[model samples]
Target: QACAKGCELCSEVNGCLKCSPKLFILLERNDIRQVGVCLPSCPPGYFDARNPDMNKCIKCKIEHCEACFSHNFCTKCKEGLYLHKGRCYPACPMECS
Candidate 1:
């Protein structure tokens, strides 16, 4: 086959260069080349970043974030963290003096 499953464009050296429609790139961070595979959506801890060249599953910038709509805004957070105004915080500050 020219490319692997879910991959629209690929290379033997680079792995998946681009993903097919409705699919996104899930990067293998451990790989030296940062190779990735195509998937239906980004997994937890990652966010979807669309581009003309390729759609990638970029890791959330928020600390302890489980899910997010954007790089800096997290919709959900990991255990021990709290979601506040689309951002994950270690603890919420008191509103009253």
Candidate 2:
């Protein structure tokens, strides 16, 4: 029987531990450690850690980012903010005051 997508190994209560090929494992960073969740790619508002030992999705550092490739590489910005050169700013440069 199937448990969940990319969850080649998991239990109902324990959730996922290992992910299938091309999938990444997400670990909860709460006060008390939790189980893992497998995802094909990181969801919006998060970025891939890209660390060999931490191939998990990390929460975006930019508070105004809609999506980010890295802390300094915001692909999209939230309303009221503008994206420029991979970073988000309060507004466009040299705009009418």
Candidate 3:
């Protein structure tokens, strides 16, 4: 279940997860691990890259890739613009013009 009011879930303690906002209790296969995590509310230029089966947080490998979905997950170059290396440049650094 989900605990609100700035709270999360747990396993070892089991309920109303009481821990740092940067941490989460994760359970899988057999071990219940406590790990630091980030929510989907990450600011622009930063995206929640956490895996579907993990509790820890994961940031995009790209330096400034917009609309990131974590380590080559996905993006938009923008209106009449192009993107690369996670940056929005007025023009590509190539002969593709």
Candidate 4:
């Protein structure tokens, strides 16, 4: 039988599309684990994770930085850094100093 999304896993193992729609949607949307899409380029302090479908770049987890494409390149520490809440910061005091 034909697979709904032509996913190899769905066709070969799951035996049908109905069993793998959730997986297909995650792959189609380029969810965090799939990391399929890519952009022409990313801004400074931001490395592309290749997830173009994401609404915004994944922010870095550096203490002071306000924003970054990924945790790999946080430029600085953001205010209230000690609070350690997970949010993108636009400004901060030098990541990896």
Evaluated with TM-score, which candidate comes out highest?
Answer: 1
lDDT score, candidate 1, position 20:
82
lDDT of 1: 0.76
TM-scores vs. true structure, each candidate: 0.57, 0.43, 0.32, 0.23
Q: What C-alpha lDDT does candidate 2 achieve relative to the native structure?
A: 0.70
Minimal lDDT window, size 10, model 3: 21-30
Report the C-alpha lDDT of model 2 over 1-97, residue by residue, as the tens digit. Answer: 6768767778776687767756777766556657789887877666775554435676676767766655547788876687888767886444546
Candidate 2 vs candidate 3: the lDDT winner is 2
Better of 1 and 4 by TM-score: 1
Per-residue C-alpha lDDT of model 4 across residues 1-97, encoded as one tens digit per residue: 4344433234353233222222222222233333222223444444334333333234354545555444545543455343234443443354734
| Clash totals, every prediction | 0, 0, 2, 13
Quantify all predictions' global Cα lDDT against the true fold.
0.76, 0.70, 0.42, 0.37
Clashing residue pairs, backbone N/CA/C < 3 A, model 3? 64-86, 65-86
lDDT comparing candidate 4 with the true structure: 0.37
Root-mean-square deviation of Cα positions for candidate 3 versus the true structure, in angstroms: 8.6
Candidate 2 segments exceeding 4 Å error: 1-3, 29-33, 51-54, 63-97
Task: Candidate 1: give the clashing pairs.
Answer: none
What's model 3's TM-score?
Answer: 0.32
TM-score of candidate 4 to 2 decimals: 0.23
- Model 1 per-residue lDDT tens digits across residues 1-97: 7798989888887788888866898867574676769988778767887766767787787877776665557888876677888777665343523
Return the lDDT, model 3, position 49: 37
